[PDB]
Write a protein that binds this ligand. Sequence first.
Ligand SMILES: *[C@@H]1O[C@H](CO)[C@@H](O[C@@H]2O[C@H](CO)[C@@H](O[C@@H]3O[C@H](CO[C@H]4O[C@H](CO[C@H]5O[C@H](CO)[C@@H](O)[C@H](O)[C@@H]5O)[C@@H](O)[C@H](O[C@H]5O[C@H](CO)[C@@H](O)[C@H](O)[C@@H]5O)[C@@H]4O)[C@@H](O)[C@H](O[C@H]4O[C@H](CO[C@H]5O[C@H](CO)[C@@H](O)[C@H](O)[C@@H]5O)[C@@H](O)[C@H](O)[C@@H]4O[C@H]4O[C@H](CO)[C@@H](O)[C@H](O)[C@@H]4O)[C@@H]3O)[C@H](O)[C@H]2NC(C)=O)[C@H](O)[C@H]1NC(C)=O
Ligand code: HEM
Ligand SMILES: *[C@@H]1O[C@H](CO)[C@@H](O[C@@H]2O[C@H](CO)[C@@H](O[C@@H]3O[C@H](CO)[C@@H](O)[C@H](O)[C@@H]3O)[C@H](O)[C@H]2NC(C)=O)[C@H](O)[C@H]1NC(C)=O
Ligand SMILES: *[C@@H]1O[C@H](CO)[C@@H](O[C@@H]2O[C@H](CO)[C@@H](O)[C@H](O)[C@H]2NC(C)=O)[C@H](O)[C@H]1NC(C)=O
Ligand SMILES: *[C@@H]1O[C@H](CO)[C@@H](O)[C@H](O)[C@H]1NC(C)=O
Ligand SMILES: [Cl-]
Ligand SMILES: [Mg+2]
Length: 324
Amino acid sequence: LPPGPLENSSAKLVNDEAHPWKPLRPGDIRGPCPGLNTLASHGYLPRNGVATPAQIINAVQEGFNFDNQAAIFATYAAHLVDGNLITDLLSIGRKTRLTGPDPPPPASVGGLNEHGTFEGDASMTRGDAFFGNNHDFNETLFEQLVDYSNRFGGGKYNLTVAGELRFKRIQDSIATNPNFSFVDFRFFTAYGETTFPANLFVDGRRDDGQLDMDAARSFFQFSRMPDDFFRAPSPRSGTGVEVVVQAHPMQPGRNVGKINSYTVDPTSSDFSTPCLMYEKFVNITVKSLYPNPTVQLRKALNTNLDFLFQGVAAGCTQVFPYGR
Ligand SMILES: *[C@@H]1O[C@H](CO)[C@@H](O[C@@H]2O[C@H](CO)[C@@H](O[C@@H]3O[C@H](CO[C@H]4O[C@H](CO[C@H]5O[C@H](CO)[C@@H](O)[C@H](O)[C@@H]5O)[C@@H](O)[C@H](O[C@H]5O[C@H](CO)[C@@H](O)[C@H](O)[C@@H]5O)[C@@H]4O)[C@@H](O)[C@H](O[C@H]4O[C@H](CO[C@H]5O[C@H](CO)[C@@H](O)[C@H](O)[C@@H]5O)[C@@H](O)[C@H](O)[C@@H]4O[C@H]4O[C@H](CO)[C@@H](O)[C@H](O)[C@@H]4O)[C@@H]3O)[C@H](O)[C@H]2NC(C)=O)[C@H](O)[C@H]1NC(C)=O
Ligand code: HEM
Ligand SMILES: *[C@@H]1O[C@H](CO)[C@@H](O[C@@H]2O[C@H](CO)[C@@H](O[C@@H]3O[C@H](CO)[C@@H](O)[C@H](O)[C@@H]3O)[C@H](O)[C@H]2NC(C)=O)[C@H](O)[C@H]1NC(C)=O
Ligand SMILES: *[C@@H]1O[C@H](CO)[C@@H](O[C@@H]2O[C@H](CO)[C@@H](O)[C@H](O)[C@H]2NC(C)=O)[C@H](O)[C@H]1NC(C)=O
Ligand SMILES: *[C@@H]1O[C@H](CO)[C@@H](O)[C@H](O)[C@H]1NC(C)=O
Ligand SMILES: [Cl-]
Ligand SMILES: [Mg+2]
């Protein structure tokens, strides 16, 4: 019941008659992900910003040609930590009554806005949770993306710009955020996310990895596809992530309660240990939210954990927080 890959994955107009941009209505939810935000604001996703895992996987495939394996891993990771496992509903932003009754602690069901579950620090266009707003578009951070595009990309965002801006944001957070955390799941997502604008926001007829700043603003700020936008011509997600990782090689770590105190975490996964990243996500992060689930919640957890495993890096063994 995770959707499979697109039967037809060719480039096509996705800013079409059936999927017009509309402004936000009172109550509509938007969050820290410009990709899901754009799909909601073009009605690929429900325009209110509440969705099921299957709607999200269909929408990122249909609207952007996100690859099926990456869609499955990201969607079921997010739903396991931020979504209501009983109703099968996830907010793409703030915590809402609309996803169902607030679960017994320590589960949070906080939507994609929930800090430290999926969302984390050193986002390109969003502030760190520590500073009080982890989801709204930040013009100072966007201006920095434009500046790094001018410096390293001839005015366009590309994998070279991604490498420099990723490092600058890490350095920004080490210097200013006493609770800065850059380990395990966020260490992985923080690098992959910087490739998405080059791989997925670039018009599919061109697919040259060079994103112009008008398109960049339209997606990041307004959740809006360019006029006549064509999706990528094949499924992809994090192509070129190794280029960004190696631009300024980092060890995973955290500040220890003061600025400029970045301490390497030797227990953290990194890009050499993708199976450990999956193992710690399920056996520490998911387990911490659902330490002794009821019979009903245990069944929903195991179903969604089976789905998550379908998205894992080839070669990893399934991990069972609740046995089999
Ligand atoms: C992802 O996460 C999941 C967790 O979410 C991981 O899955 C878990 O993995 C752990 C580790 O394998 C499992 O823990 C093991 O559980 C078994 C079974 O426990 C149950 O059965 C025993 C025995 O019951 C029988 O006998 C009694 C009488 O004695 C009867 O009354 C019964 O009816 C049975 O016939 C019970 O004693 C257990 O009760 C305890 O636990 C329950 C529930 O918590 C309590 O309510 C009880 O009151 C009681 O406290 C239970 O019912 C168990 O036998 C294993 O114990 C052995 O290993 C532990 C840990 O040993 C290591 O760690 C310590 C440091 O903590 C260190 O000192 C040691 O040297 C080892 O490094 C020992 O403490 C025990 O003494 C015992 O040791 C013996 O056997 C081991 C070999 O395994 C050997 O090392 C020793 O030398 C010694 O001979 C153990 O606790 C979980 O069950 C499992 N959970 C699930 C859901 O599957 C998953 O691994 C992870 N994945 C990854 C990839 O990381
Ligand atoms: C598959 C389902 C997806 C989920 C669950 C998801 C979830 C998230 C979340 C929670 C964040 C916030 C992380 C952070 O920066 O703190 C994020 C960031 C991001 N996502 Fe998504 N996402 C998905 C798919 C996509 C797609 C398809 C795109 C591109 C079309 C995309 C582009 C981005 C970008 C660019 C960021 C970084 C924003 C920034 O740092 O300024 N995502 N995603
Ligand atoms: C958007 O993101 C930007 C960039 O990360 C945030 O900018 C930071 O905002 C804080 C204040 O809220 C500034 O802190 C101040 O620094 C001065 C001078 O060093 C000091 O006198 C004050 O005590 C205060 O701490 C900080 O300088 C600033 N950083 C940058 C690069 O501009 C911003 O808050 C985010 N949100 C919004 C709504 O823009
Ligand atoms: C990011 O943009 C910069 C600037 O366009 C690229 O560096 C240029 O690459 C072209 C190759 O087609 C060369 O003709 C120039 O010599 C380079 N100019 C500068 C200023 O370095 C870089 O290749 C781009 N990165 C990616 C991954 O596409
Ligand atoms: C796949 O999609 C494109 C739409 O851009 C279309 O031209 C092509 O015919 C489609 N293939 C099939 C078998 O329908
Ligand atoms: Cl695919
Ligand atoms: Mg963030």
